[PDB]
């Protein structure tokens, strides 16, 4: 699909919130454990994401995620416009006993996902370089 398209969703595990961004064309994932499903957290995550990748458009499965003034401010400033979550919960479960904190097991799972086999990590850089 278009190389600027991302999907963002918030999942739940162990009483905490995981925000999951998927680069649609590639399957590459960037995830983070957040204190609460708040618009401040979504806005901050979108500023970080957009500084690292050319984010053009963002989709979500919960449109109310994007209603806060603060999320709209982040999209305004960065020039943003408007399944993989169970493959990620699968990998998290496999490595969970190897980390104390869930946040650590999440980043391990992102690592495993992105480098598994090309890999999602390799596809996203190919797709984006080719576009340039
Ligand atoms: C809380 C913690 N303490 C750790 C490690 C490793 C070590 C020696 N210590 C100190 C320790 C634990 N027990 N003893 C007998 C000593 C780790 C860790 C580092 C790299 C990976 Cl890949 C996975 C875990 C984490 C990890 O947290 C971090 C990533 C630091 C926020 C986690 O959440 O487990």
């Amino acid at each position: 699909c278009s190389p600027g398209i991302w999907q963002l969703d918030c999942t739940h595990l162990e009483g905490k919130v995981i925000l999951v961004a998927v680069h649609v064309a590639s399957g590459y994932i960037e995830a983070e454990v957040i204190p609460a499903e708040t618009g401040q957290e979504t806005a901050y995550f979108l500023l970080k994401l957009a500084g690292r990748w050319p984010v053009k458009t963002v989709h979500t499965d919960n449109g109310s995620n994007f209603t806060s003034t603060t999320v709209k401010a982040a999209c305004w400033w960065a020039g943003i416009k408007q399944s993989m979550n169970k493959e990620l919960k699968k990998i998290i479960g496999q490595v969970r006993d190897q980390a104390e904190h869930l946040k650590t097991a999440v980043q391990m799972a992102v690592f495993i996902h992105n480098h598994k086999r090309y890999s999602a990590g390799e596809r996203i850089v190919d797709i984006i370089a080719t576009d340039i």
Side-chain angles (χ1 to χ4, degrees):
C1 70
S2 157
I5 303 174
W6 288 79
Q7 173 115 359
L8 270 64
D9 297 308
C10 274
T11 35
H12 307 263
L13 197 64
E14 305 172 22
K16 295 180 179 72
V17 172
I18 314 168
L19 207 176
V20 180
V22 192
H23 181 247
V24 178
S26 73
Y28 166 101
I29 284 174
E30 218 178 291
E32 205 96 44
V33 172
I34 64 175
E37 271 199 18
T38 81
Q40 290 200 351
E41 295 297 330
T42 300
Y44 185 66
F45 183 97
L46 277 163
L47 286 174
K48 283 191 293 99
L49 180 70
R52 293 148 181 65
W53 303 100
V55 184
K56 274 62 202 272
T57 60
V58 179
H59 192 220
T60 183
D61 279 352
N62 182 346
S64 84
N65 279 333
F66 291 168
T67 63
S68 81
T69 308
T70 73
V71 170
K72 310 220 191 95
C75 292
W76 170 81
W77 189 86
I80 306 172
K81 318 295 146 56
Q82 197 165 356
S83 294
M84 279 267 117
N85 282 235
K86 302 310 183 189
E87 178 52 42
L88 193 61
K89 288 179 130 153
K90 180 181 127 183
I91 299 165
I92 285 168
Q94 300 166 353
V95 307
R96 187 68 190 86
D97 56 26
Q98 322 183 12
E100 174 181 351
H101 305 300
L102 174 61
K103 72 184 190 180
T104 302
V106 175
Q107 301 312 328
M108 285 165 90
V110 165
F111 182 107
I112 288 156
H113 174 77
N114 283 336
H115 299 147
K116 192 149 62 181
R117 293 197 178 178
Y118 288 76
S119 63
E122 288 158 344
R123 284 188 302 267
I124 184 171
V125 294
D126 179 72
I127 290 167
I128 300 283
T130 298
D131 196 46
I132 293 164

